């Protein structure tokens, strides 16, 4: 259809937690969604010679009652990341807001610095509206997201391994 459908199979503490299925707002933020979709299928090659892929990447920062962050496919700690458009790409638009849990939004390091890192909201995050591009939402597997929330801490550090064991487009 108009909007792409992608998924993450999540492993927590080396144990399958289930699948998260996302609906990408391809009709509102095409460039942003295409980047995420391509990173789920691993169809593009990065600047390091490896194909950009969320498979086996981890959720390095989870803060209960805030959000789950991942996508650092280069360093796995937040300092890295890479998009199919290069180290970073411009903010498409901020039409969609973080008005509810289960939203897929781009993490960044200030204006126009989107790469591969993203976060899934656990509550409404109004203070991020206009600063982070919301490009999708969870349509199935919110229980898995809640399972991940359980692994976070106020510091954000994730004591037990939260990994994406598989991913792709549906």
């Amino acid at each position: 259809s108009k909007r792409s459908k992608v998924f993450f199979d999540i492993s927590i503490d080396n144990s399958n937690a289930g699948r998260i299925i996302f609906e990408l707002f391809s009709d509102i933020t095409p460039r942003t969604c295409e980047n995420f979709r391509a990173l789920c299928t691993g169809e593009k090659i990065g600047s390091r010679g490896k194909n950009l892929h969320y498979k086996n990447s981890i959720f390095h920062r989870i803060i209960p009652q805030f959000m789950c962050q991942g996508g650092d496919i280069t360093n796995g700690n937040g300092s890295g990341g890479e998009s199919i458009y290069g180290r970073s790409f411009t903010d498409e638009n901020f039409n969609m807001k973080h008005d509810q849990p289960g939203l897929l939004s781009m993490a960044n390091a200030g204006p126009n610095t989107n790469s591969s890192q993203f976060f899934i909201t656990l509550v409404p995050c109004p203070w991020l509206d206009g600063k982070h591009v919301v490009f999708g939402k969870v349509i199935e597997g919110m229980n898995v997201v809640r399972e991940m929330e359980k692994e976070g801490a106020k510091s954000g550090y994730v004591k037990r391994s939260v990994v994406i064991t598989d991913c792709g487009e549906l």
């Binding site: 803060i63 650092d72 300092s79 890295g80 993490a107 960044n108 390091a109 790469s115 890192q117 954000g156």
Partner: peptide
């Protein structure tokens, strides 16, 4: 505080 950044995470 509560932000989602890539590299210098602040309060």
């Amino acid at each position: 505080x509560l932000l989602v950044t890539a590299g210098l995470v602040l309060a």
